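Deviations from the work plan: none for this task. Representative record:
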Amino acid sequence: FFRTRDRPLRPGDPYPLGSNWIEDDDGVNFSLFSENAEKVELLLYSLTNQKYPKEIIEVKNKTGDIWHVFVPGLRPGQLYAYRVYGPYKPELGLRFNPNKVLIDPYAKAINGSVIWNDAVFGYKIGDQNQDLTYDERDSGEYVPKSVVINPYFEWDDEDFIKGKKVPLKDTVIYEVHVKGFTKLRLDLPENIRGTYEGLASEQMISYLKDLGITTVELMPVFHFIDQRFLTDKGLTNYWGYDPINFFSPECRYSSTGCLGGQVLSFKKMVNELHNAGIEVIIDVVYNHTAEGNHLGPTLSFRGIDNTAYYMLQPDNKRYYLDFTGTGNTLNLSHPRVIQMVLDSLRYWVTEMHVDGFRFDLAAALARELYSVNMLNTFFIALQQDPILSQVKLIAEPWDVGQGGYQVGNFPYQWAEWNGKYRDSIRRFWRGEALPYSEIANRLLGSPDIYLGNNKTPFASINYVTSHDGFTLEDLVSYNQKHNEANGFNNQDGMNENYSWNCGAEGPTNDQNVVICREKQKRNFMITLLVSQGTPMILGGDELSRTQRGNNNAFCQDNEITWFDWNLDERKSKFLEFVKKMIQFYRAHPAFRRERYFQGKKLFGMPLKDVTFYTLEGREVDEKTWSSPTQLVIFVLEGSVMDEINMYGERIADDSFLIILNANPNNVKVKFPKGKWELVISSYLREIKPEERIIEGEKELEIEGRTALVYRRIEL
Amino acid sequence: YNHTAEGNHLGPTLSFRGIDNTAYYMLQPDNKRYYLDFTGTGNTLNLSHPRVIQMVLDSLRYWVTEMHVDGFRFDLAAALARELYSVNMLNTFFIALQQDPILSQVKLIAEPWDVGQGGYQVGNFPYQWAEWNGKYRDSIRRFWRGEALPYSEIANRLLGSPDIYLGNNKTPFASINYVTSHDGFTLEDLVSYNQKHNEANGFNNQDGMNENYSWNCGAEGPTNDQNVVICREKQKRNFMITLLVSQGTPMILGGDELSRTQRGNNNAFCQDNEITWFDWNLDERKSKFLEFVKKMIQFYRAHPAFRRERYFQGKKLFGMPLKDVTFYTLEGREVDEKTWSSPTQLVIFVLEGSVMDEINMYGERIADDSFLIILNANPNNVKVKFPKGKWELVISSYLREIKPEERIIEGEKELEIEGRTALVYRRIEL
Amino acid sequence: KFLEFVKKMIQFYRAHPAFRRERYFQGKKLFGMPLKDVTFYTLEGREVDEKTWSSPTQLVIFVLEGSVMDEINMYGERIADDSFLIILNANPNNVKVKFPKGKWELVISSYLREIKPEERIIEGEKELEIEGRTALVYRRIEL
C-alpha cells in the first residue's frame, strides 16, 4: 500500500517531444502535449510481461499545455505507453477513454503493430449508437508499446557528403518499395531480403549505380498500421500510406528487430548509400493518420487530444473532415500539430540524414478549414526554417478534396509531381492528337505550368509511371484495371488510365503485339529522358516489372508486387536500353537545364536555341502551333543555350534533332539544313544504313510509333 | 520589430520602402498610399508577409547563435500580432517562433500592448512568454502614494498576480514586477515630482504621459526641507522592499540604486546629455541607499519563498497545521471575504516557508524561513497586533535607529507602526 | 511476492530525503516552527519522558517531521519531506496504540493480510489494535 508519491521522480522539461534518454542524469525525460486532457499516466512495460503495466506513473507536472516527468533509472530500450484521462463528449469532439492505451506521437521506435480487437475503439462496436458509446474495455494487451531509443550513431564518411550533393539539375529519381526491392533477391541472404539492410547491401548499391540513378525515393517508412478491413480479408498494407507515427521507421522493414534496431538499421542503410553518392528521399504522409474517421480505432491522437490533431466538421465536431479519402485529415492549423510536422521533418533530416521528402497528397497540408491556402502558417514556417531550407521538397500537388488540384501553386524551393506531363504524354503515344502546344510544352519542362510562379524546370518531376497506377509494362499491356485481387470487386482504383494494350490485353504470344509494346516502352523511356526537367523512374520498370493489371496494389504483399530479378532476354535487353538512355540524359547538359528555352537566337548567333518543325522541313507557324498533331519535331541548339553554371561559365552541348512520331501510320520527314547522324531509335529492328546519316534536307520514311534522336555532324 | 525609422509616408527612403514597400509595411488597404500606424511612430512592419516573418526570426536567430544573446524584450509586442487591424496571438509569426528549435530556448519578454485600439493584451501572450506587469506598476505606485485600493487588488500583485497570468496556465515568474522603467519617472523622480517636466524636449511639454501616479513627499523638485528628503528616502526604500518581496521576477531600473535623477523628465528619449548620463559621484545619502538595494537584492536571491515556480494556494498542504500564506488585518484576526474586498492602506501577510509546493529540478521540496511583512501606506500611524509567534526584525524602511521595542516581538504583542512604513519579520519561535 | 516488496521498499527510501539525511535529528523545533523535527512516543499518544527513555521496550513509535529538517542540499536549499509515523511493535502479543494529533494514512505494513479498512486511515488521536510482530509507516494527510 503505497502512493505514486513514494517513487523517486523529477519534474521534467518539455525540452524534447517524447522519449529522451539523458545519459548524464541516468533516466528518461517523458513528454506528451495535451491541452484538453485532465490526467495523464505513464505506463512502463517489461519485455517479458507486455499486457499489464509493470508500473503506473501519473504525470503531475505540467508547463503550459504540456505534461512531463523524468523517471530515474530508466534506460534505452524501455517499453512504454500512455493513458489519457478527460471528458467523453463525442457530440462535442472530446473522445477521451483512459481505458485505451495510446502510443507516444513522438516515439522514435514502436514495438509491434496492432492485434485487431473490438477493444481498441473507444466505442462499443456492436452498439446501435455507434461512436456515441463509451466502451470501457482495457486495450493495453493489443496496442504496440513505444520504445525509448538510443539516438547516438557514428556516421562514418558521411559528414562530408553534405553540400553540393546532387543538384536538382542533374537528379534522376528512382522510386522504390523497400521490401519489394529485395524480397525475391535470393542474391542476398534471407532475413535481410526486403528490409532496409537489404536495400543498402553491396549487391544493390552496385546495381543502383550500375543503372545510374542519382537519388532513391523510398515508399512510406513512417510506422504504419494494416487497417482492419484489410486484415479481415487476409490482407496487409503493402504501400504504408496509412501511418500512425512520424518519427519511427517501420518495424516490418527492420532486419534487427523492433526494439530500437529499426532506427539503427535505417541509419546504417542511408550511411551506406551516402558512401556511394546516392541521395535519399522518403515518401511521407502528413495528411492523414491510420486512426481513420469516427468508428475508427482510438490508438493515440484521438485519445491524447482529439480536438487538436484532427479536422472536424465545425458545426458538429463529432464527425471528421476528410480531404484524403481515408476518414480523417490532420488539422495542420493547430500550432502544436505544426510543431510536430516540422519537428519530425527536422528529426529525419538531422538524425536520420535523409535528403528530401515527397509529400503524399500535399495539398491537404494547406487546407485551413474548407479552403486551400498555400500561404498558410505551416508552409511559411517550412520556408523560413534554417535546416529544412536546405533539403529537397517535392509535392504531390493535390488532394481529393474540392478545389484541391494545386499544380504550380506550391512556393519556391518546391518541386511538383507533374501529372499533366504524365497524362498527356501517355495520351500522345496512345494515338491521340493533342495540340502541338500541349506536347511541346511538356517536352520543354512545362513553362506554361510553372513559369507563372517563377519556378524552373526542376520543379517539374516528369514521369510516365508511379506507385499510383500502372507500371510501364502494364501501361502497354492493359486497357482496363484488373484489381480483383484487392478484394473490393474492382470498385477501387481509378478508371481512366490513358492506357493502350498494343492490341491485346494481358500477356501474349502474338509477337507483333509483344514487339509493339517493346517499341512503346522504348518510346516512353526515350521521351522522358530528353524532356526538360527532373525525370523519375518507377522502381522495377527497367526490369519491365508487372503487377498483372493491378493499378492499385496497396494491399498486395506478395509476388504481384515483388521485384522479379531473374530476366529472360527480352527483359535483359530492355534493361541495357534504359541504362544507356539514362547515361545519355546525364552526359548532355542540353536537358539538365536550369533555365527554359525561349524562341529566339542569343549571344549574337545565327541559330535559334530551339526550333519546332513539321513533317516537311518548315518552322511551326502560329496556327499550326495550336492545331493538333501526332508528330512533334524540334531542334535543340546546344551552342546557343542561356545555361550558366555556378562558376559563371555558359554551357554548350550538341545540336540535337528529336523526332517523335506517335502516328500509327508511316510518315516521311524532310530534315532541315545540315548533315545528321543517328543517335538511338525505338526501332528494335536492325537500323537501316539509309537512316544512319541524313544530309541536305533529304527525306526519309519513319515507321509508325517511333522516336528518334539525331546529332548534327556538319553544317 | 514593430516599426522602422523610415516613418510613415513623408518619411525618408533609406531601405525597406525602396526595396519593396508593399511587402515590408502595413498599408491602409483601401488607399495603400498611407501607412497603418499601430506604434504611433508612422508605420508598422507587416508581419503577415512570409519574408518579413523570415527576416525577424532570422534576426532573432542571428543574435542568439551569432551574437550569443540570451533573450529579448519586445517593444510594443502586441503590434507584432496585428493582422490587418485585429490582434490575434495565434498568428503565423508567433507560432513559428514557438516551434523553432533554438528560439524555443531563450527568454521572450513582451511589452504586452501597442498604442492601437484594442491593443492592451496583458496575459494573452503565449506561454514561454513573460510580460511586463504594468498593473503591478500602477497599483503599487498608487498604494504607497496614499490611495486605498482593495485588499484583493494589491494582495494579488504581491503573490505574483495570479488573477492575470493563471487563466492562461502561466507561472509566477512569468510576471515581471517593476516599479520604474525607462518609460516615465525614475525612482528618485517618482518620489520627487507630481507633474512632467519634458520642457527640455522641445515639444511644449505635450509628450510623455500625464498620470504618473506620482507624489512629491512635500515639494516638487530639489529641496532642503529635511522632511521632504526623508519621506522620500523612506518612500524609495518602501518601493524597494515591496518589489523584491513579491512573487515573480523583479526588474530593477538602471541607476535607481544610485538614486539617479532625470530632473523630472519622464520621457527622456531625446536627451543624450547629463540628464540621462549616470551620475557616479555619490554622497552619503546616495551611498547608503546603494547598500540598502544591495542587501535587499542579496535578500531576495537568498530566499526561495520569493523565487517560486508555482503560485501560493490559500491552503495548508502536505498535512501541515499552517497554510502556505495567511492574510491579517490591524488585529491579528484573519482576513474575511468582506475585508478582502474593502479598500485598505495596510496589508499584512504571512508566508509559511516550510509548507510550500515548491520542488526543484531534482524532485526535492524546498521550504524557507517563515516571514511576516507589514506594508502600511496609511500616512497616519497604525498599531498592529502580531500573530502568535515570536518574530524578529530583518529589514524595514525606517531611516531612524531601530529601537528595541521593534526588534523582537512576542506573543500577539501590539506595536506602533509609523505611517508609510514597510517591515519584514521572521518567526523564530512558535 | 517478497522480491516485489523489497523493490517497492527500496523505491521508498530513495524517494524520500527524510531518511537520506546528511545531518542527524536532534530533539527540538527549528526555523521558528511549532513542530519538533522528531518526537518519540509510547503506546498511548505521549512523548517519551527521561526515565521511560532508558527503560526497556518491545515497542518504538516516533514521528519524523519532514518540513522541519535541518537538511541542506549542495545548492544551499533546505529540504522538506512528509511527516511520517513509524510504529515498530516487536511485542509478540497485541497492543492498541493511541495515535497523536492529526489524520494519518497507511503506507505499507508487514501484514501479509488484506489490510483492514479501519487501519487504512487514522484520525483524531483514536486508537487501533496492532497485531504482534508488526511494522507500520503512516503519512499525515491533514492537521
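Residues 1-310 of chain B form one domain.
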